[PDB]
Design a protein around this ligand. Structure first.
Ligand SMILES: *Cc1c(COP(=O)(O)O)cnc(C)c1O
Ligand SMILES: *Cc1c(COP(=O)(O)O)cnc(C)c1O
Ligand SMILES: CC(=O)N[C@@H]1O[C@H](CO)[C@@H](O)[C@H](O)[C@H]1O
Ligand SMILES: CC(=O)N[C@@H]1O[C@H](CO)[C@@H](O)[C@H](O)[C@H]1O
Lengths: 792, 793
């Protein structure tokens, strides 16, 4: 009750923060409330873990280098059914819970979709009652804080643990040693990796509360600690601890740095030991049942080294015969592929691996040897097949194809969207899937309806609950029941009203953050995600300029006002992406300050886009931009978040976009541009950018405007690199989709002119978004890959 | 009551540790109990701080680079009066209180006596109800952990915060920026220190509970945090945070490293800002006229010397006060404590280094110096040497700043730590200065807290005394003189000795389990524990051990008082001699300990990893305390006081506080020997010829040749060449010059040890006269004659 929550809060403020109400700070209150909320998890956390030991169900281990978790407080309050009461207690204490909630640092230990999927999964798995564990690195610094200086992205260290994290519990008794470098000996008592360097792995446990269900699972993040001149030797301890120091800020791009390889082995070695530990300590030659008790999901190839590591443990330590160890290994691992771009592919140079992980390279060679021995046996005269299927790339400086390793060391390989999984199976890994068709499957991504609905959009969640009950929260497929209210004008009005309140709250945020007067009744056109060429924020920028020009040539023409928001972080070393940011801020400066356009159109670059900000901007969106070149977005997930929160989608037939269309009906989505096939034919025929440039007046003007310095007077050639790429090196064919895009955009504004018809489509969307719950995704994984059963 | 303490303990284990009794670990329990104990401090902590704001009494600020605090749990339980109840609750919960307590990591943010004095002071000041604050650095790594490998000291990182510290509370809202480097700008708006590098200073507060008195003061320790290639730039953040990373392991030795200078400015800048900020927020542009009446900053040796030019910098560059005023307020604010006379310990920073790190401060230091010498010239026109002798700058060769001179001129009071010491500091070392201002120089004999050094480390003795004279002595140690009434009490003397016996037995067990050696429980425990240093003469002790060993061989049947000689202490990592002397002791130990001839007649142990928590163990179990520093080298000493309070007799020179212990207990009740400060001066004049004693004393010569010929290092006959060479041609501490008197003195000790009744009689005379050495007395004198603050009860 309220009375007791206030007692607890005041107790923590007193004993935990050691503060008086007259000298407490907002951070003091936030921490007090956080502890008060955490205390309500303890019982179920301890109980849940105990229960797994007692009933010994098969455990699922999600191994990933990233966990884009965002904030915890509110998510915990909601999942525990404590939000309303905490809200009231904090209120009665003369405080604003929303003010306390903003003090919390995001746990941005991720780059984007890949890291956010793990976070959503952790939520679903706990909600479905699975004995699941999240394993990753406790980066001292997550994804950098993006600031905008003179229109350019600037990075600042994300010191998220500076003031402490009340949601974690260090478990020193489970500390483990990790080995790096050294050499290998093949003694008569088994082979031995000796003269290695050791780095301790200290685990920190974070509670993962299921939604209203008695389950609180665990997320275990490891921290690196260290085991001439004295002072210097002490300072040098920083080198070992530098391993879990900061997250590599790359999204869909492989950067073969040695430190990154260390991070990868670090988490893979600490996790496997811990897993083997817990197994050999369970109630249960003993390892014969390992695969029936353990399931390790490989989040992309980053934790690929987990395969040769398990084998290493099985053979070098447990002394099992290779045959057995290898059989158990394949049964233990499952690999998820989320890559398409060739630059995202992880190909480690054998020289680097040999120097850091000598024993693992040997194991990888062995796996490869036995692997190709099989192909040769099956396809004798196929010599190319061998080099095409080898885990080693001999071409020039030899490199290890981590994906091939994952495919051979796993009993299941999956894509993240029908379209994606199909290309992965039939195209990218045809040689492999041909041998074992059954191994390759699909698992369309999903998002958690808790954080992405109940939490970020209470108004909508409430509206829906009032009309169909709260069952939808644990079974989102229940949203189809909203189809009964299609002809309900009072409901459509309520729906729109909810969206209006969202836009207003967010508009305030914008006005206070940026010096710009937002038009509360304008259509909110939002494209938020990591800045990437394949994502085409550039394409969007051409439409904004294209829109601006139209306003000048006819400032009196009836126009649907718009507030175009574009946000996203750029990898620090991604030049183009950083150039595209400058362009947007540049175009924004002109548009936003032209007295001619005035309140007809406003452009904002949403700074520091992250999970907590996404929860703010998504619920306030009218139009969601998902315009990646066909075949480039494996699936996407932000797309699903917009659809669930009442936004219409303008996008290509790419990733999950295709499935959202299947569910809601293509006509209820603004699909445009060329499809995967058209992109192939254009590739064959060849891509001549200038053609569209000369063929389309609207475009040409936009381009020349960009090229001539219209958006950068003091630096006319500022966007030279962009213009050059656009014309001679655009793999994502921006101009090839410009016409269809702008045409599509016009149709959007048209429908926006008919409120009743717009909210009708919106409803058709929300009502058909159930499929995209990460609860459905996890059920399919558990059923067809992990072989585990859910409980309640 | 017990019932409630058990409730809280179980609540913390559950909610704070998130653990079940079936999976909890000992550390889990230790942390649970710690939190349970901390909770009982909160009210008084919050209340005490509030009270200072309300009644605004003058605040004392102890600025030091070291705070050797040891463990907190038990000390907190005792001071709060919760030990019994906590003891009770943990017992009923079926847990071993001793096992939980030994879990606690030592807070060794100090090197030895200088850092331990601050820790003791914090305790007294809180016990006396003073509005005092301790300010220092929160080193991630304190004094290294010493291990012994192949008889050699080995250092291991002291990762004391690895599992967390339940006694601290980070206060981020009080975070401050510190500046380094940059350049000085001389404009019309004045002087602007521009283009500096910034390092954040994050404070962590630790409660300092007074003994049974409602007061809980604060110890504020600062942590450094940071404000091309991205990843690399992030990793490079380690450079700023490296400032508060580890404590420099030097004792009585100056190591002019730039990082150390950074640590020194870091703590001095964060502290002054914080002090100035609390002053403005107090109830007193801004008016600082009353600053000195509200603030007192005690400089613990010259390490935080930069605090002077920094206050001036703040006063002038920021607050815009006129130099005249700022300088007047500054002197009234600062007081400086001189802790040593060892030239090699003297802090003399090269002006080039300071100029590059703290450009503005060098200017301020020059200004201070200019105005300073301007005064001397006015008073002593024809005295040109006096000028260079009194200058804050040493122009001799590479110019250096004499931090001590700076402290003397920027303080209204300068003090030594023992009568003998303070006298040399005043009349000799700084005669030129004291001559000008006699009244500025004073003495404040050191003291130790009777809480941690009696009640905590020696419950049996504390209890015995309480049973005979009441517990008033704990807050007024002078009450120990009441124990003189039991001089002719044979039953009491027997009880006293018994207490000591139980101590020796408990510790003997420790030794047997730690080291593979059979200790003789009835042997006299000869202990010399302190930092390894030549001036301290552990080497002298080693010659007596060898001298003793040789006697046992030439007559294994001679009636002999058995002994267990223990020698412990850490050596500064880069201190060669000290590390050689350690090897010698372990070497001599190996021979003696394994000679079937000597057997249980004599055993030698090198107490590994000597630290505060171990000192609490070995001191109460000591019969003979070795305080044999060369006359004039130990400013005061404090371990000496700890032994005296715990029932050990003292064998030592007339040095430091040894002289005062003698005054109190009576010289005849102390085993004083060797030459005194004067004799050392005459020998210096006459010159020191080591070989003389070597050739003049057979016992010695044999010892030496034994050492020199490889008797103690067969596989390496010349191993101790450097030692032998120093002993003969470069021994500034005249080890041979005191060898005869020393060994003679040692014999007298064994003699008295043969008469139990007469030995415990002297011991009683010692314990009964140790009251003066309570840090409660020391702090009272500081408050009274330096800080001008009144105690609150
Ligand atoms: C959901 C989410 C993403 C993934 O978005 P896409 O548009 O699918 O790339 C990226 N960043 C954040 C902060 C997210 O919440
Ligand atoms: C008291 C104490 C000292 C001081 O010893 P002296 O022999 O007086 O130099 C040094 N270290 C520790 C651990 C102490 O407790
Ligand atoms: C390498 C990588 O980060 N892939 C990303 O993964 C997420 C989650 O699978 C997909 O939705 C998205 O399309 C894709 O860009
Ligand atoms: C510089 C330094 O560490 N000096 C030491 O200070 C302590 C505390 O005052 C004295 O007891 C001791 O004699 C002296 O050696």
């Amino acid at each position: 009750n309220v009375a007791e929550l206030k007692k607890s809060f005041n107790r923590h403020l007193h004993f935990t923060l050691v503060k008086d109400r007259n000298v407490a700070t907002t951070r003091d209150y936030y921490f007090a409330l956080a502890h008060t909320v955490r205390d309500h998890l303890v019982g179920r956390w301890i109980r849940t873990q105990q229960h797994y030991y007692d009933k010994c169900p098969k455990r699922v281990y999600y191994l990933s280098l990233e966990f884009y978790m965002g904030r915890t407080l509110q998510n915990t309050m909601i999942n525990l059914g404590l939000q309303n009461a905490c809200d009231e207690a904090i209120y009665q204490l003369g405080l604003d819970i929303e003010e306390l909630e903003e003090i919390e640092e995001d746990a941005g230990l991720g780059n984007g979709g890949l890291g956010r999927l793990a976070a959503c999964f952790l939520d679903s798995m706990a909600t479905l009652g699975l004995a699941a564990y999240g394993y990753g690195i406790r980066y001292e610094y997550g994804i950098f804080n993006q600031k905008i200086r003179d229109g350019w992205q600037v990075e600042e260290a994300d010191d998220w643990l500076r003031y402490g994290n009340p949601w974690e519990k260090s478990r020193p008794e489970f500390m483990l040693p990790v080995h790096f470098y050294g050499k290998v000996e093949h003694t008569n008592t088994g082979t031995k990796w000796i003269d290695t360097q050791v780095v301790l792995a200290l685990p920190y446990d974070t509670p993962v509360p299921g939604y209203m269900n008695n389950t609180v699972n665990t997320m275990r993040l490891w921290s690196a600690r260290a085991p001439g001149d004295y002072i210097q030797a002490v300072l040098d301890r920083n080198l070992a601890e530098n391993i879990s120091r900061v997250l590599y800020p790359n999204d869909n791009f492989f950067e073969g740095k040695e430190l990154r390889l260390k991070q990868e082995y670090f988490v893979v070695a600490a996790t496997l030991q811990d897993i083997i530990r817990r197994f050999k300590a369970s109630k249960f030659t003993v390892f014969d049942a390992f695969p029936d008790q353990v399931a390790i999901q490989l989040n992309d190839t980053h934790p690929a080294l987990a395969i040769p590591e398990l084998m290493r443990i099985f053979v070098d330590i447990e002394k099992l015969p290779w045959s057995k160890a290898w059989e158990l290994t394949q049964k233990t691992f499952a690999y998820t592929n989320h890559t398409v771009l060739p630059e995202a592919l992880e190909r480690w140079p054998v020289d680097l691996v040999e120097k850091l992980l000598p024993r693992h390279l040997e194991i990888i060679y062995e796996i490869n040897q036995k692997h190709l021995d099989r192909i040769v046996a099956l396809f004798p005269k196929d010599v190319d097949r061998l080099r095409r299927m080898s885990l080693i790339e001999e071409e020039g400086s030899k490199r290890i194809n981590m994906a091939h390793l994952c495919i051979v060391g796993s009993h299941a390989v999956n894509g993240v969207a029908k379209i994606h999984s199909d290309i992965v199976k039939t195209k990218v890994f045809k040689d492999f899937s041909e041998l074992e068709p059954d191994k390759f499957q699909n698992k369309t991504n999903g998002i958690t309806p808790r954080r992405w609905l109940l939490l970020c959009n209470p108004g909508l969640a409430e509206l829906i609950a009032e009309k169909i009950g709260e069952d939808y929260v644990k079974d989102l497929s229940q949203l189809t029941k909203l189809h009964s209210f299609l002809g309900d004008d009072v409901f459509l009005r309520e729906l729109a009203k909810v969206k209006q309140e969202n836009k207003l709250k967010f508009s305030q945020f914008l006005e206070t953050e940026y010096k710009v007067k937002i038009n509360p009744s304008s259509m909110f056109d939002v494209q938020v995600k990591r800045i990437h060429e394949y994502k085409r924020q550039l394409l969007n920028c051409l439409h904004v300029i294209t829109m601006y020009n139209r306003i000048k040539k006819d400032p009196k023409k009836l126009f649907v006002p718009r507030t175009v928001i574009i946000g996203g972080k750029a990898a620090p070393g991604y030049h183009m992406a950083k150039m595209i940011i400058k362009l947007i801020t540049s175009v924004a400066d002109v548009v936003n300050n032209d007295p001619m356009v005035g309140s007809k159109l406003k452009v904002i670059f949403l700074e520091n886009y992250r999970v907590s900000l996404a929860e703010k901007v998504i619920p306030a969106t009218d139009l969601s931009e998902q315009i990646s070149t066909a075949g480039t977005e494996a699936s996407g997930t932000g797309n699903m978040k917009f659809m669930l929160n009442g936004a219409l989608t303008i996008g290509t037939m790419d990733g999950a976009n295709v499935e959202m269309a299947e569910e809601a009906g293509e006509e209820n989505l603004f699909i445009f541009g060329m499809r995967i096939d058209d992109v192939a034919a254009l590739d064959k025929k060849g891509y001549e950018a200038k053609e569209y440039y000369e063929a389309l007046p609207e475009l040409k003007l936009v381009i020349d405007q960009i090229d001539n310095g219209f958006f950068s007077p003091k630096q006319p050639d500022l966007f030279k690199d962009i213009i050059n790429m656009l014309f001679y090196h655009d793999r994502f064919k921006v101009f090839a989709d410009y016409e269809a895009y702008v045409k599509c955009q016009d149709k959007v504004s048209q429908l926006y002119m008919n409120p009743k018809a717009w909210n009708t489509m919106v409803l058709k969307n929300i009502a058909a978004s159930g499929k995209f719950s990460s609860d459905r995704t996890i059920k399919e994984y558990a059923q067809n890959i992990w072989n585990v059963e859910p409980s309640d």
